Each structure stands twice: as C-alpha cells, then as structure tokens.
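PROTEIN DATA CARD
Card holder: Thaumatin I
Chain length: 207
Origin: Thaumatococcus daniellii
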Amino acid sequence: ATFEIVNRCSYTVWAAASKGDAALDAGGRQLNSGESWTINVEPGTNGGKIWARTDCYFDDSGSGICKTGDCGGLLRCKRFGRPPTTLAEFSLNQYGKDYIDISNIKGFNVPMDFSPTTRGCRGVRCAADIVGQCPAKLKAPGGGCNDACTVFQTSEYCCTTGKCGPTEYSRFFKRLCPDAFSYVLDKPTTVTCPGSSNYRVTFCPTA
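Structure generated from the sequence above:
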C-alpha cells in the first residue's frame, strides 16, 4: 500500500512510521514545510502508526532528541514515540478490509488528516488547536498536549482495570476532535476501508 505523508505545517516535522517492533519503510524522515514523503507499507501490516515529531535534532549517525514523539532517540523510528503524539493508526488486509483511525489516547502534538487516496471510505481529521487550548495539567513542558493517562498514570485515565469512563480531560480531546479516539474506551471512530487501499497522512491539513 502506498502512503503519502505530507507536512503542510509552517514548522519542520520529523515524520515517523512504525508497527511497534520495526520501522515501516525507512521509519522516519525530516519534512521541512511543504515537503512530502511517500512510503510503501507492506500488505498485512497490523498495528501500524504514523506520527509527527517536533523540535528534533540528530547527528550524522541518526541519533538525537525530539521534544514530541521521540522514538528511542532515532531518526529512523523502529518503535513507537513518546507522548504527546497525534496518531494515524492502521491495520491493513485484515480479513479483506483495512481499518484506519486517528487517536488522541497518547496526546496531541500536530494537527492531522488521514484519508484514503483510493475510493470507497471516508477520511478522518483532527485539526483543532488542541495545543493552544490544552488544559494546564496536560501541557507538556516540551510542547504539545499530553493525554491524562501519561500525566496521572492511574486506571481512571488509563483504562487498565474495571471500566473507565470519560473524564474532563478525555472530553476536552473529544469536543475539539469528535472523529478521533479520546480514551481507550471511547465509542470507536475507526473507519473500515476496502482492503489494499492507499492513503495520505497530512500534517496541518488545509482548512
């Protein structure tokens, strides 16, 4: 499957693509403002994610530090990144269908659209100014807006035992972006697409 990853933000982002135990394609790339990166994601990739990282720097060997979304200090991500990260999530060719969503369960850093570039399903978008509006306790000192499970680390917000419910923090993410997941047990906003669709992930999509 083809994924085009497009940075329309005014700031540089360092895009990342991983399925948690390995890179997808080259795993990461610097995208200056306006730049696009097209990758191939192998059919059958389950649990893939694409995200932006902000405020990074790397040496000639590809090692360094990002202020949001860092993945083990690498330019070429093998594994998932540190919150806060708006997440484009996908699992492809699963019993004939692909499944896509955007999630704020790991916080929000950069506005995102994630849409098919082939026919037959909808895209999703979370492009409100969540960082500007982020409540105080969720503001991440390196920029972006943490989710409450990262900040508070109890099942009230992390949904690991019992049956968690919304909180004012999840509802903040859900109100600003109704089509993205706001906590682990939110009503699902996943879209079923034809198997073997192609996609575009756009950072700072045009309004």
